[PDB]
Amino acid sequence: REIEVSEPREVGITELVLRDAHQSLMATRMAMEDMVGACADIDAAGYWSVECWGGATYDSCIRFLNEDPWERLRTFRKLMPNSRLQMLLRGQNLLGYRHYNDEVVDRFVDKSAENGMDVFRVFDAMNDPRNMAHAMAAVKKAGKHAQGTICYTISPVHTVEGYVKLAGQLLDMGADSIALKDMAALLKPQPAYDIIKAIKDTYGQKTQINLHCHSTTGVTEVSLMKAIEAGVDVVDTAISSMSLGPGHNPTESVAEMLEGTGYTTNLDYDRLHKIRDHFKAIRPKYKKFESKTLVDTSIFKSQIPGGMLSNMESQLRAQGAEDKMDEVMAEVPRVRKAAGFPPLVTPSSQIVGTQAVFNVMMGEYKRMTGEFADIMLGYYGASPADRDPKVVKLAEEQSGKKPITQRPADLLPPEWEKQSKEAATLKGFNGTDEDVLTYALFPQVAPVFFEHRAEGPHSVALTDAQLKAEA
Amino acid sequence: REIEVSEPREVGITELVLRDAHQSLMATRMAMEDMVGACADIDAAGYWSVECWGGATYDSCIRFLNEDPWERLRTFRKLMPNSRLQMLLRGQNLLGYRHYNDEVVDRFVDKSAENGMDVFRVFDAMNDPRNMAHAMAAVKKAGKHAQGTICYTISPVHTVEGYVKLAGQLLDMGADSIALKDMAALLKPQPAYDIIKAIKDTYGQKTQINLHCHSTTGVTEVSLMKAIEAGVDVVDTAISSMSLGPGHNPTESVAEMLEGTGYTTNLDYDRLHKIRDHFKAIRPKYKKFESKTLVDTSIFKSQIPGGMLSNMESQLRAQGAEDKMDEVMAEVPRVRKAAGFPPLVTPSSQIVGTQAVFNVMMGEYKRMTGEFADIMLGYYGASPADRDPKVVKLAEEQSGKKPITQRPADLLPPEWEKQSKEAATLKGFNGTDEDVLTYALFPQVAPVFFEHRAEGPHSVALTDAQLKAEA
Ligand SMILES: [Co+2]
Ligand SMILES: [Co+2]
Numbered sequence: 001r002e003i004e005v006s007e008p009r010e011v012g013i014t015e016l017v018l019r020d021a022h023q024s025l026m027a028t029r030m031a032m033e034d035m036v037g038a039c040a041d042i043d044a045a046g047y048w049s050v051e052c053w054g055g056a057t058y059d060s061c062i063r064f065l066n067e068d069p070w071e072r073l074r075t076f077r078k079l080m081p082n083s084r085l086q087m088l089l090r091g092q093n094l095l096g097y098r099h100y101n102d103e104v105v106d107r108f109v110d111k112s113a114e115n116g117m118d119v120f121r122v123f124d125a126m127n128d129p130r131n132m133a134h135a136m137a138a139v140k141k142a143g144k145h146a147q148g149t150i151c152y153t154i155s156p157v158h159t160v161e162g163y164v165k166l167a168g169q170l171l172d173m174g175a176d177s178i179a180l181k182d183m184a185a186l187l188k189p190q191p192a193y194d195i196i197k198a199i200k201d202t203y204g205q206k207t208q209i210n211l212h213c214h215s216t217t218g219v220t221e222v223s224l225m226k227a228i229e230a231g232v233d234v235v236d237t238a239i240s241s242m243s244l245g246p247g248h249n250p251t252e253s254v255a256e257m258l259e260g261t262g263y264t265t266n267l268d269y270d271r272l273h274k275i276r277d278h279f280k281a282i283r284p285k286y287k288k289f290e291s292k293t294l295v296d297t298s299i300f301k302s303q304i305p306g307g308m309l310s311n312m313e314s315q316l317r318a319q320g321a322e323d324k325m326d327e328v329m330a331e332v333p334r335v336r337k338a339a340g341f342p343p344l345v346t347p348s349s350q351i352v353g354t355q356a357v358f359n360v361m362m363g364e365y366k367r368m369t370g371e372f373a374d375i376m377l378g379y380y381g382a383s384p385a386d387r388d389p390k391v392v393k394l395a396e397e398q399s400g401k402k403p404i405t406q407r408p409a410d411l412l413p414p415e416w417e418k419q420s421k422e423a424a425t426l427k428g429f430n431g432t433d434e435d436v437l438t439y440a441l442f443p444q445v446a447p448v449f450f451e452h453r454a455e456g457p458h459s460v461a462l463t464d465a466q467l468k469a470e471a
Numbered sequence: 472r473e474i475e476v477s478e479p480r481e482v483g484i485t486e487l488v489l490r491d492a493h494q495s496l497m498a499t500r501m502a503m504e505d506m507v508g509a510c511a512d513i514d515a516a517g518y519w520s521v522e523c524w525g526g527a528t529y530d531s532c533i534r535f536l537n538e539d540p541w542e543r544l545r546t547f548r549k550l551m552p553n554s555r556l557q558m559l560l561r562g563q564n565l566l567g568y569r570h571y572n573d574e575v576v577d578r579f580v581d582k583s584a585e586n587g588m589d590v591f592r593v594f595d596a597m598n599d600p601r602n603m604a605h606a607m608a609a610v611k612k613a614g615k616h617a618q619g620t621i622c623y624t625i626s627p628v629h630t631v632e633g634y635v636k637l638a639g640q641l642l643d644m645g646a647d648s649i650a651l652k653d654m655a656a657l658l659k660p661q662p663a664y665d666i667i668k669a670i671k672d673t674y675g676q677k678t679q680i681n682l683h684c685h686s687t688t689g690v691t692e693v694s695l696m697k698a699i700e701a702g703v704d705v706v707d708t709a710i711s712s713m714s715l716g717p718g719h720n721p722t723e724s725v726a727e728m729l730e731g732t733g734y735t736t737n738l739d740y741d742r743l744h745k746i747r748d749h750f751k752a753i754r755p756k757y758k759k760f761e762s763k764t765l766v767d768t769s770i771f772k773s774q775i776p777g778g779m780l781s782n783m784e785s786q787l788r789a790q791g792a793e794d795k796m797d798e799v800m801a802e803v804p805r806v807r808k809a810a811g812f813p814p815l816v817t818p819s820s821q822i823v824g825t826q827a828v829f830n831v832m833m834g835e836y837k838r839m840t841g842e843f844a845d846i847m848l849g850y851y852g853a854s855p856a857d858r859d860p861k862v863v864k865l866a867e868e869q870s871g872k873k874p875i876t877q878r879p880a881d882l883l884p885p886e887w888e889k890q891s892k893e894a895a896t897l898k899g900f901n902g903t904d905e906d907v908l909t910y911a912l913f914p915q916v917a918p919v920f921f922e923h924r925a926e927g928p929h930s931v932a933l934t935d936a937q938l939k940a941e942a
Contacts, residue, residue, distance in 0.1 A: 001475065001476050001478050001479075001733075002475050002476065003473065003474050003476055004472065004473050005473065005474055006472065007472050008472075188727065188730055188731065189729075189731075190730065190731035190732045217724060217727065218692070218715075218721045218723075218724030219692075219724045219728035221690075221692060221693055222692055222695075225693045225696065240689065240765075240767070240768060241766075243689075243765070244689075244715060244765050244766065249689075250689045250766045252689075252766070252768040253689030253690045253768060256690050256768050256771050257659055257660050257690035257693045258660075259659055260659065260660075260662065261660060261661045262472075269772065293751075294711075294714070294715050294765070295711040295712075295714060295715065295721045295724055296711070297711060297721075297723040297724060297727050298744070300727050301740065
């Protein structure tokens with residue numbers, strides 16, 4: 001019995017400590033002040049890229065830290081001059097709350113690249129390539145690296161062949177590399193090997209694939225080893241003092257585990273040690289935002305991500321039917337199916353979760369939320385599988401909207417000029433496209449932020465004094 | 472490029488939640504009251520064995536919980552009637568502070584088996600087979616399972632061939648199985664595969680090997696997968712709510728990661744879920760005893776286990792030279808070498824660590840502790856490599872003891888009758904061999920314990936009230 005493994009080679013590593021690590025472990029509340037001190041070492045560690053922007057950090061900066069996201073980007077570009085900066089961008093949704101007209105996507109990408117972003121990991125919650133298409137083109141126009149993304153999930157319609165097809169569609173829209181995202185740590189070892197190998201066998205060894213796995217279920221570092229045996233080019237990790245739990249596998253652990261296998265990373269262990277210790281000293285200040293579960297494999301049976309489960313709980317707590325949780329968890333699968341089995345990541349997870357609670361309370365689709373209606377009617381794009389025509393009809397007969405099947409942005413009219421005018425009437429607006437984008441992405445937060453931005457970035461973390469006083 | 476892997480098969484699992492998990496995560500303070508509620512589910516989970524005795528639990532029971540270790544054993548045998556109970560026994564040292572005469576080993580093993588112990592994992596801190604020989608024979612006489620142990624470590628003298636030789640010596644003394652112990656999580660993936668495969672190739676596939684790895688460095692779950700590909704029969708894990716950090720890899724994670732690989736475990740996921748939730752509800756009460764580091768790979772460079780490092784720190788704090796820590800960490804390697812490269816596990820780690828601090832302060836072996844002197848003079852047994860003759864001489868010229876090279880217990884005279892007499896003069900002594908053993912193993916604690924035992928077992932964990940009041 002034998003297993004074919006890739007030839008001895010160097011495996012690239014993407015550090016997530018500056019973005020996804022704290023987004024996953026301390027609600028994206030990491031203050032810029034607590035990160036800049038590790039930039040010099042991070043820049044000289046030897047990482048393939050440094051994820052430090054995008055995701056929920058834009059929202060967090062303006063909503064909780066009174067920090068300008070564009071200033072964070074500029075500072076990181078300046079303190080890590082020799083590194084490839086990387087961000088996560090939700091396609092046509094950008095970092096916003098809805099799909100935007102193509103010109104807004106163009107502006108955003110152009111300004112991101114202009115301010116220093118090198119690698120753009122573009123993804124769509126439902127894996128609809130059409131929603132990633134324009135952002136990808138904008139990234140290529142800016143001469144930057146376009147990383148098309150495949151959100152991994154487990155469902156009756158997701159298969160290896162299905163993932164290989166998506167990889168092809170991403171390569172067809174000019175992807176420079178393919179990212180396999182596993183936000184819920186659902187990727188097991190064998191599937192990791194099979195999917196990576198199938199993509200490499202189908203499109204060629206030159207096809208660059210970056211694997212992003214969280215450690216929530218505790219099985220993905222083994223998946224990382226299997227992905228490396230299958231030939232994956234780069235794997236995402238988080239410095240050891242900011243890893244595990246709903247976060248990611250440890251950078252140092254992944255580097256150390258390869259000794260003697262023929263595979264290696266070229267990270268500087270001394271630099272890694274300094275970055276570790278830097279965050280180990282700072283992490284305690286964020287205890288009020290930490291999660292309390294290091295390993296949870298329940299999703300392999302329920303299909304429900306811990307985050308999604310908590311939300312439904314709170315929704316079943318604030319109403320009075322905490323007794324129907326076992327019923328809700330049984331309803332979710334049915335709602336997911338009806339919606340076409342979309343991956344259960346934001347926002348699909350909230351939409352499916354909330355609708356599941358309604359069906360239990362008010363009754364079988366008796367009342368559909370505005371979001372669920374939009375998903376069923378195709379306003380978020382195509383689903384991995386065909387949506388239940390019966391539930392679709394009900395959505396149409398309850399929202400008054402006609403079902404659509406083409407890229408949603410095709411219906412969106414130009415809005416930049418409209419956004420610029422409205423933004424320019426806000427006290428604090430600095431007249432840059434960056435600020436207009438801030439208003440376009442977060443209309444209800446931009447006002448307050450522009451007004452207080454002059455006060456400078458803050459921190460919602462405990463102070464050393466508060467740490468001591470508490471101890 | 473290919474890698475040979477074992478044929479599809481069932482992999483056995485040993486659950487550590489009742490012994491090593493809490494010894495490693497909350498200073499062995501887990502109260503019997505907090506464990507008995509999960510016994511029924513643990514007994515029906517499908518584990519190959521349940522480690523629930525030995526190690527530091529005997530000391531903890533009588534020193535901190537006013538609990539009779541023998542009563543804990545009897546209760547576990549009664550609540551888990553269909554399971555193979557397993558314990559850790561430090562050979563000729565038993566669970567005590569020194570080597571004992573062979574008749575004490577006979578008594579202990581006989582009473583352990585009589586009270587219900589099924590599998591005895593016998594080990595010696597310096598991997599000297601002669602110190603394991605008699606316990607192993609006693610285990611075989613009692614008709615129980617003798618698991619000879621190899622303490623894994625990394626040193627210039629430890630090699631695959633060296634481990635294969637030890638495995639042979641263990642099999643020659645009647646071992647029913649071989650345990651590979653990696654208390655510091657030093658076993659990387661390739662070495663795990665190479666050592667397991669070499670033992671299987673040399674002594675036959677019928678040779679049973681159980682792998683015990685902690686997760687301290689964060690690389691051992693990958694090692695577990697490699698060990699399984701190499702053909703390991705059983706791997707030790709800890710239920711997910713009591714895992715990771717200086718503890719072990721998660722039971723559920725290890726079981727889930729095998730899906731589709733051809734390997735499988737036959738654990739009942741529902742029973743595992745109940746055991747998880749049981750301990751998740753109880754673990755918060757032990758926060759005052761939790762460690763604060765989930766992943767630490769520094770040992771791959773320093774050879775110093777976190778626990779060993781902390782101790783030296785405190786010793787360098789309580790004296791005034793916290794400035795010489797970088798010097799101490801540089802001295803340890805030299806002391807280890809001089810001692811013959813013994814694995815850095817208790818008590819060798821403390822002995823080497825303390826001596827390292829002296830050499831830095833008072834000077835190069837200017838003053839040797841009584842323990843270090845005994846190691847250098849062979850009173851703990853043979854070292855993996857020859858000890859520095861120059862340091863040996865100094866030990867002899869400073870302790871007045873002649874160096875020995877034969878099994879230390881060969882010099883020990885009968886002591887049972889002496890132990891019985893002394894023990895019988897303690898208020899509370901119940902006249903059983905069990906109590907005499909308690910006195911023989913912990914002379915200075917037995918008095919206090921026998922006097923308060925009637926008050927019943929206690930807990931040093933926070934009460935629900937204290938948990939709430941604190942929150
Ligand atoms: Co992520
Ligand atoms: Co252990």
